[PDB]
Design a binder for these strands. Structure first.
Lengths: 98, 108, 79, 92, 93, 104, 98, 87
DNA sequence: ATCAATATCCACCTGCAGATTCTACCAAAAGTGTATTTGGAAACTGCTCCATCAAAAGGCATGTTCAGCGGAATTCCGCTGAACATGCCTTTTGATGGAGCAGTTTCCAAATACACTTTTGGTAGAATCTGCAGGTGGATATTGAT
DNA sequence: ATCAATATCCACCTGCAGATTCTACCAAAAGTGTATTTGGAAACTGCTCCATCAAAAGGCATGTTCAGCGGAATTCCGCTGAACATGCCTTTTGATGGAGCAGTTTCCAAATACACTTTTGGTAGAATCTGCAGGTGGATATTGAT
């Protein structure tokens, strides 16, 4: 009965995903959200396949970087577990809450 | 056969006639000098070479011959200056640079 | 719900590419809310460019133009 | 539908004769050239207006470049530029 | 001659606060505000028109620009005020 | 002979703005409605910020609006604060604000 | 002898300066710093007095906003004392060296 | 004075009391001793960058005098738009 | 130190999806040859305001003492996230009508362009006006020792 | 809580510099009125490519177990905030010479402006190749338990 210790697989995932470039969010679900959010701005809309793709590419690129800054904030407070206050602080200094 | 292109005169690969056309129809000024499209095309060609040269090496370094997005990202974010110039740009399918904060590594 | 369609495993994967080793249980919800605000801001601008051009189809360029205005310039889909 | 794709390819072959490039990569390059063009042209526009001038010249393109590009990159961009205008001006 | 939106800022000032004045440094800031917003809007109009292969900037471009630039309520009211002014200017004859 | 501002029922100069549009090279042509619509939007916005600056002055027992008044009006209003989130109003100071943990 | 407890005069000062708008850096000294840097950049330059005031106005608005962000980074660490690490965290997130 | 002298080490003109006052308006209650030198460093880089562009705008206008507009345009470029000096 | 279980590399193989070399019809470019126009440099110069020297005085920077208390280091102990493998739902993949996105033709309302004519927003120069900055006293807090 | 030291609050009060007030000239605007030109909306349409339906494909939700991380409590010290003494250098008020900035007329190199001719860069349907990504196989490093 084998088992990897806490964090050993996490580190492994970090290594894997920083090597690759594939989108990490499942497309269909992402597309639903996009369309849903849009319907609030103009009813009965169509989307070029590439329009949805540009938005997903932009969104993951954004979140990933926000996860980088969040990590730095957790670490600044001598932790290794990112928390909401960490995301809040980052966006706040980014001026996204200013 | 003869009428020589402006790009060939300036000894450039980039289209001077087009850069000139694009400056005019761009509404940047009432008039556009003759040298501007030349100078500007020269600058775009140079920068284009700068990135391709670096992205090419990233391709070599990966035992690959065809330059893909990943290669371009690796070339940009690894160059202090190019990285600064594209500090607020996102290269689709570029991924990030491999990087793990030390304090997150297993305590050897 | 759709926003809930952005699953824990996916958010965790993003965090990973971002270099995160340990993730608090409350991050997931927090993240969606952030992702939601992002999309609203961007889509709202894209759709404004769609209507301006009297169209019923948002185009990659409408998104690219939006992104540029948000200071989120994207290479790969035009402009 | 114009694009800098061919000239991008030509420059590629001078730098890495045996290296190719994927579409998605070519698309990224294209965006790159348009972005820089817009940034440089725009500054040159402001430059002229600030000085109540009706014309955008090589002068304006150079300063625009000094303001936009990082140190060393700017240095070379200025030379390449100056070179091309000279060669051009010295040709029947 | 150096033009300023000053006399116009002052007229409006008297409309909203009949007995209030403004220091020149405050007026100076106000003049910068009017120029700044003008440029952002015209700028947006400029691009909006190019993205559409349109050589003309109309009241319509100015409107989408305003929509893109100003926050919620400000945008709602500005569009209204501008529409209103065009409609009226239109009807003088 | 009436001005276009009067014709439009505006206080801001419709001619100056139509003129400025041209000289700024934003397009080949500038329609007649553009300057009218823009002069209105410009006017509407200065009214808003002057309304709020005037109140700030009043609150600080002042008759003449000064920079700090403009700064308080902008930073205290969400929309304006957002519209000017990267603008620096010289001689405006900051809004009084002390984080909780710093108190006794 | 009367003596205010440590931190009382500090809050007094915060309320004092947050209630005012005059510049806080001595004028002449700031001007020399401007001339020194400009000079070690291009000799023989002159300055409109208002160009130096515009620079001081912007530099003080810049530093004050930076100290706020720094203050937040320190409190994030459960501290009340700002340290270089805080100033650095804020600038890295702000994208001034990220 | 009798004169024409060398500018040198003026960054120290940004005194500790003056930096403290700035942190105060910034709502800061306690300051570590290492903050002052770090602040001078941050200020110097800020200035070098605005002056570099401003002075670039001056040269382009073939002038010897840096104007407030030069500084105002340099600030806009840098995303730090300034109101009150002509822009 | 000694295995035992896994994850990680690697060298080789190969099918095909995306990269490419070819052909040709061609309109939008781009180059070219001539006549016309004009922006902005050179040259003269009026006059703003920038550099600078001067003197005085008090707001403030500097430097020291002293000890309160904030920061860090250390021990502790719940509880919360990570690892996991258990069984199933949604997503991804590939094929078919249709509604819009464009390519085209048209003609009219609207925007130049231009020659006057008239009204206005700037200005520098005289002079009076007026909010408030900053000095003052003393009455209401706010602090901190006891 | 009561009490003494101090800071803050604040309405009263007038000289001063910054704001509001004309009288003037005004050419630069902005408006007025043809004449010429055209951009783009509107109608009609043909091919894309976008939305949707079926199905074979595979990453996620769920419950359990527990080690390890993060916050609480305790402790010690050295550093940073008050407070105070001393004195210089910044701030202020003025004047002075002259460097440049900015105004004005002048006029040629360079730029707009068609018109004419050549050609290249993009679209398209066809045909062919080829870099490499999954896939296999076996070696070996990593990780974790004892």
């Amino acid at each position: 009965p084998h088992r990897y210790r806490p964090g050993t697989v996490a580190l492994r995932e970090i290594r894997r995903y920083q090597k690759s470039t594939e989108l990490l969010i499942r497309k269909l679900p992402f597309q639903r959200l996009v369309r849903e959010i849009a319907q609030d701005f103009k009813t009965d809309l169509r989307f070029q396949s590439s329009a949805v793709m540009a938005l997903q590419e932009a969104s993951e690129a954004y979140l990933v970087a926000l996860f980088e800054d969040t990590n730095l904030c957790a670490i600044h407070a001598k932790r290794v577990t990112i928390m909401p206050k960490d995301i809040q602080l980052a966006r706040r200094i980014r001026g996204e809450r200013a | 056969a003869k009428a020589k292109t402006r790009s060939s005169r300036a000894g450039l690969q980039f289209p001077v006639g087009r850069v000139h056309r694009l400056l005019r129809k761009g509404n940047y000024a009432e008039r556009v000098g003759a040298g501007a499209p030349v100078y500007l095309a020269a600058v775009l060609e140079y920068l284009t070479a700068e990135i391709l040269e670096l992205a090419g090496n990233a391709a070599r370094d990966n035992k690959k011959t065809r330059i893909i997005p990943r290669h371009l990202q690796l070339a940009v974010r690894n160059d202090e200056e190019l990285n600064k110039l594209l500090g607020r740009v996102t290269i689709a399918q570029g991924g990030v640079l491999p990087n793990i904060q030390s304090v997150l590594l297993p305590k050897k | 719900d759709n926003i809930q369609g952005i699953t824990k495993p996916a958010i965790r994967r993003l965090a990973r590419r971002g270099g995160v080793k340990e993730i608090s249980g409350l991050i997931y919800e927090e993240t969606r809310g952030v992702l939601k605000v992002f999309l609203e801001n961007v889509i709202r601008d894209a759709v404004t460019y769609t209507e301006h051009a009297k169209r019923k189809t948002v185009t990659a360029m409408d998104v690219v133009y939006a992104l540029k205005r948000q200071g989120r310039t994207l290479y790969g889909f035009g402009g | 539908k114009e694009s800098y794709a061919i000239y991008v390819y030509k420059v590629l072959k001078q730098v890495h004769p045996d290296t190719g490039i994927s579409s998605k990569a070519m698309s990224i390059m294209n965006s790159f050239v348009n972005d820089v063009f817009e940034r440089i042209a725009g500054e040159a526009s402001r430059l002229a207006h600030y000085n109540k001038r009706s014309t955008i010249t090589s002068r304006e393109i150079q300063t625009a470049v000094r303001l936009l590009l990082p140190g060393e990159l700017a240095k070379h961009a200025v030379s390449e530029g100056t070179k091309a205008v000279t060669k051009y001006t010295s040709a029947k």
